[PDB]
Amino acid sequence: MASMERFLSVYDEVQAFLLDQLQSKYEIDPNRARYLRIMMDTTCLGGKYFRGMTVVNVAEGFLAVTQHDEATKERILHDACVGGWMIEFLQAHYLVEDDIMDGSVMRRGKPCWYRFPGVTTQCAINDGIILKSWTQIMAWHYFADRPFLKDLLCLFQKVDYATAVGQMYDVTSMCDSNKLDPEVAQPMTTDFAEFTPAIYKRIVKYKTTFYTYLLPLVMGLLVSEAAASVEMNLVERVAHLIGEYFQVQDDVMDCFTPPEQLGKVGTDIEDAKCSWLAVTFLGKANAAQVAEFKANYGEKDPAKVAVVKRLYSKANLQADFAAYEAEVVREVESLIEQLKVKSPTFAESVAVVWEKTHKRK
Amino acid sequence: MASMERFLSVYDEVQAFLLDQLQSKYEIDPNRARYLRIMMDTTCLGGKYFRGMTVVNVAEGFLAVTQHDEATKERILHDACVGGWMIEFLQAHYLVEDDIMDGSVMRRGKPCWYRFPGVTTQCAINDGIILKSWTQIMAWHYFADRPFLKDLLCLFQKVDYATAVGQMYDVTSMCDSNKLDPEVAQPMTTDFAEFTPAIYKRIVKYKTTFYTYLLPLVMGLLVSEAAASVEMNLVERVAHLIGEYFQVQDDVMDCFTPPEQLGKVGTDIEDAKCSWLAVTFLGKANAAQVAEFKANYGEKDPAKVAVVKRLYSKANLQADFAAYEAEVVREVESLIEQLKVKSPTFAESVAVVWEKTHKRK
Numbered sequence: 001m002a003s004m005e006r007f008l009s010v011y012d013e014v015q016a017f018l019l020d021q022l023q024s025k026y027e028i029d030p031n032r033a034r035y036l037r038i039m040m041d042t043t044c045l046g047g048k049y050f051r052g053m054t055v056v057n058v059a060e061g062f063l064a065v066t067q068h069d070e071a072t073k074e075r076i077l078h079d080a081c082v083g084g085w086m087i088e089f090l091q092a093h094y095l096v097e098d099d100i101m102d103g104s105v106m107r108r109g110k111p112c113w114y115r116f117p118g119v120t121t122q123c124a125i126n127d128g129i130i131l132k133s134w135t136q137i138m139a140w141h142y143f144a145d146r147p148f149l150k151d152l153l154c155l156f157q158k159v160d161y162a163t164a165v166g167q168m169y170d171v172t173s174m175c176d177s178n179k180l181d182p183e184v185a186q187p188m189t190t191d192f193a194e195f196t197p198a199i200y201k202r203i204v205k206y207k208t209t210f211y212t213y214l215l216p217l218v219m220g221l222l223v224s225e226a227a228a229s230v231e232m233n234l235v236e237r238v239a240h241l242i243g244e245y246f247q248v249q250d251d252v253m254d255c256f257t258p259p260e261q262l263g264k265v266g267t268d269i270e271d272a273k274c275s276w277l278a279v280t281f282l283g284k285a286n287a288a289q290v291a292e293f294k295a296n297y298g299e300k301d302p303a304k305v306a307v308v309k310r311l312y313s314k315a316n317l318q319a320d321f322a323a324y325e326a327e328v329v330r331e332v333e334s335l336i337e338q339l340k341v342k343s344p345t346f347a348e349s350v351a352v353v354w355e356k357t358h359k360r361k
Numbered sequence: 362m363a364s365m366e367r368f369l370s371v372y373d374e375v376q377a378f379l380l381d382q383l384q385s386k387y388e389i390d391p392n393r394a395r396y397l398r399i400m401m402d403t404t405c406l407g408g409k410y411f412r413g414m415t416v417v418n419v420a421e422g423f424l425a426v427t428q429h430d431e432a433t434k435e436r437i438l439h440d441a442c443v444g445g446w447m448i449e450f451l452q453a454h455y456l457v458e459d460d461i462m463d464g465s466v467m468r469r470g471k472p473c474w475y476r477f478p479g480v481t482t483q484c485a486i487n488d489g490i491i492l493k494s495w496t497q498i499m500a501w502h503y504f505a506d507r508p509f510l511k512d513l514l515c516l517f518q519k520v521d522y523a524t525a526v527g528q529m530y531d532v533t534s535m536c537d538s539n540k541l542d543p544e545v546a547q548p549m550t551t552d553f554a555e556f557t558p559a560i561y562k563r564i565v566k567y568k569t570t571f572y573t574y575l576l577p578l579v580m581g582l583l584v585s586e587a588a589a590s591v592e593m594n595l596v597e598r599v600a601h602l603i604g605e606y607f608q609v610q611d612d613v614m615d616c617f618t619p620p621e622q623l624g625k626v627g628t629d630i631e632d633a634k635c636s637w638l639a640v641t642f643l644g645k646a647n648a649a650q651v652a653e654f655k656a657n658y659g660e661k662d663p664a665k666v667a668v669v670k671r672l673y674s675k676a677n678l679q680a681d682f683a684a685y686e687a688e689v690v691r692e693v694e695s696l697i698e699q700l701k702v703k704s705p706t707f708a709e710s711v712a713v714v715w716e717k718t719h720k721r722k
């Protein structure tokens with residue numbers, strides 16, 4: 001059976017399970033079940049399932065080299081699909097809550113869930129809560145007797161917490177750290193002293209890399225009982241390296257990808273985000289370019305936004321980007337080779353994870 | 362050592378642990394640590410610690426009848442305090458997110474966290490995420506080697522999910538179920554056909570009883586290794602019975618307790634909540650009183666709010682309340698006696714849980 005159709009079919013199974021349980025144990029009525037079903041589909045479906053399918057792909061790799069009965073192959077593939085959905089639903093939690101926190105308008109070319117007329121923020125906050133709760137319900141039901149339960153839940157819990165800490169890092173990235181104070185309304189930085197490569201790296205590491213790269217790779221190892229085929233420090237290194245690059249691509253697309261292709265009107269500049277473009281620009285600008293950036297960044301005015309985009313284009317950030325890509329392509333290749341000492345298989349899955357990232361469009 | 366000072370001291374220990382871990386593993390800087398520390402204190406402290414101290418009290422009860430070395434008594438008490446804080450922090454998650462969802466202004470006589478000038482909704486949503494993440498971090502660190510880990514995490518996970526489903530039940534309680542639809546803005550009910558005792562009971566069961574009563578009692582059993590001293594069906598029955606009464610008291614206080622004592626301006630009537638007062642009033646009203654209730658409920662206008670309060674006072678809901686209290690006092694007494702078959706100890710803890718609830722003021 002092709003991997004994606006297995007994955008998709010497990011979505012239907014897991015949804016049915018979730019909703020039936022709500023009826024049989026949580027007293028739900030049919031109308032609220034339908035609401036939840038619609039919420040699930042709208043928030044979990046329609047992406048490319050990069051994350052959840054990496055779990056399947058890692059598991060498929062091990063299956064090709066490991067002796068098992070047919071029933072055990074099917075069990076492993078089903079557990080990888082369930083695991084993959086846990087990650088998709090965790091992403092869906094974060095996208096719903098982030099869209100509300102950021103006042104986002106669209107995502108993937110449709111309104112953000114909270115903007116739907118019969119949702120509202122009041123419901124959407126809780127719907128996003130539910131989405132993460134469902135990841136646990138899936139795990140306890142499908143993995144109850146599994147040896148990897150404990151490790152998987154502990155891993156998931158750390159990845160979730162890493163992500164939440166990343167979200168803080170991101171939303172506070174245009175404030176001066178020394179002025180953070182619940183009691184005082186926060187001003188935008190005026191010096192941009194914290195727009196550095198190291199501070200950027202921290203935001204991105206936590207905000208995305210753990211759930212987008214570390215968790216899919218490690219969950220595939222866990223459902224395969226293969227965590228001893230890897231050096232885990234290497235897996236975390238490669239995950240953070242690739243996930244950084246992922247984010248750099250997202251930052252460049254926010255500023256330069258047409259909204260129709262983006263699924264989104266990009267507002268990083270108006271929002272004063274600590275983006276790769278801003279940090280790279282500040283790393284090479286002269287005094288007068290810096291001052292022009294400071295007078296124009298983090299403002300809603302479209303003319304000031306256009307001034308910042310013009311400054312980036314004049315600064316030929318394309319060449320800094322090509323140079324960053326080359327260094328990544330090189331470091332990722334190094335790490336793949338180190339991964340081959342213990343598992344050619346696993347290294348190949350990481351290679352596929354890299355090709356897909358590098359060519360994403 | 363007195364129970365409350367142990368409990369409070371464990372708060373300091375757990376905070377220190379959390380923040381130190383953020384520094385040592387999650388790359389946090391001192392300013393954001395201070396923000397998190399302030400958030401923790403502001404959102405977790407200053408209530409009466411009813412929930413978390415019930416865990417301690419249940420454990421103390423068992424300690425008085427069970428042979429242990431001194432070190433084991435201390436371990437059990439420390440685990441009960443850690444468990445109790447898990448519940449307090451889970452409550453803190455829900456109060457932060459509920460205050461944002463409901464547009465609340467005050468809680469406990471201070472501004473809701475999201476209203477603090479240097480918080481904002483953007484941060485507060487994520488801060489509430491973090492508060493629930495911390496409950497898991499505590500559990501995995503403090504309970505890693507404990508026999509009750511699995512059971513405790515699974516219990517906590519179900520209680521959290523029950524609560525989230527309760528939140529939905531609550532925020533959708535003034536809508537007609539058949540019209541729920543993400544695509545369509547939701548109108549207030551005009552028939553009030555779903556303001557029944559059974560529908561009320563469902564809201565309250567899920568929204569509060571699981572985390573406020575079931576989880577403290579059962580967590581005290583788990584940290585004590587005493588879950589075989591009880592019939593669990595009885596514990597869940599008593600928990601839901603007492604938790605209902607709790608909520609009825611909260612509903613009456615929202616309408617009739619002075620804001621200075623309430624910590625809050627009560628808005629259940631303007632919000633068209635399915636409150637005990639509304640359901641009880643509708644259960645005894647004549648046709649013309651019903652029509653007057655319908656023309657006045659769920660409106661911001663203070664004169665219409667005053668019309669609804671006048672209607673409740675004319676209807677002598679005090680007498681329906683006294684009659685409800687008597688039936689509860691009777692049912693709770695029945696269940697306490699059933700609990701004594703297996704554990705006088707545990708029954709006494711439930712008695713204390715009841716006295717405290719009944720006399721809360």
Ligand SMILES: NC(=S)Nc1ccccc1OC(F)(F)F
Pocket residue numbers: 025026516519520523571575597
């Ligand atoms: N025994 C059950 S099935 N109790 C229960 C019932 C309905 C929903 C959730 C539940 O969780 C809890 F047991 F942890 F309390």
Ligand SMILES: NC(=S)Nc1ccccc1OC(F)(F)F
Pocket residue numbers: 151152154155156158218222227232236
């Ligand atoms: N405690 C955990 S979860 N450590 C961990 C971290 C990062 C990757 C893998 C890890 O262990 C696993 F193999 F059990 F998942």
Ligand SMILES: NC(=S)Nc1ccccc1OC(F)(F)F
Pocket residue numbers: 252256257312313314316317318321
């Ligand atoms: N206009 C610029 S400075 N664009 C740019 C910057 C960094 C990476 C790629 C870029 O080219 C792209 F926008 F066409 F993709």
Ligand SMILES: NC(=S)Nc1ccccc1OC(F)(F)F
Pocket residue numbers: 047048049050246356357360361
């Ligand atoms: N929607 C996208 S671009 N998702 C994605 C994320 C990270 C790597 C690759 C990705 O594309 C892929 F799914 F097509 F592979």
Ligand SMILES: NC(=S)Nc1ccccc1OC(F)(F)F
Pocket residue numbers: 155158159162210214236386387
């Ligand atoms: N080995 C570790 S300590 N990894 C890690 C690092 C910093 C924060 C969270 C972490 O969680 C994860 F291991 F699951 F990936």
Ligand SMILES: NC(=S)Nc1ccccc1OC(F)(F)F
Pocket residue numbers: 512513515516517519579583588593597
């Ligand atoms: N699966 C769970 S958690 N069942 C459960 C439900 C309600 C109360 C107690 C329960 O068992 C416990 F004793 F392990 F916690």
Ligand SMILES: NC(=S)Nc1ccccc1OC(F)(F)F
Pocket residue numbers: 613617618673674675677678679682
């Ligand atoms: N005015 C009313 S009908 N009050 C009321 C209703 C139900 C329970 C108690 C009540 O007395 C209290 F408000 F003073 F507490």
Ligand SMILES: NC(=S)Nc1ccccc1OC(F)(F)F
Pocket residue numbers: 408409410411607717718721722
């Ligand atoms: N703040 C209050 S009234 N908490 C509470 C909740 C449920 C039962 C009793 C309570 O009072 C107590 F803490 F004082 F006991």
Ligand SMILES: [Zn+2]
Pocket residue numbers: 098099101102170
């Ligand atoms: Zn965001």
Ligand SMILES: [Zn+2]
Pocket residue numbers: 250251254
């Ligand atoms: Zn972006």
Ligand SMILES: [Zn+2]
Pocket residue numbers: 459460462463531
């Ligand atoms: Zn609410």
Ligand SMILES: [Zn+2]
Pocket residue numbers: 611612615
């Ligand atoms: Zn209330």
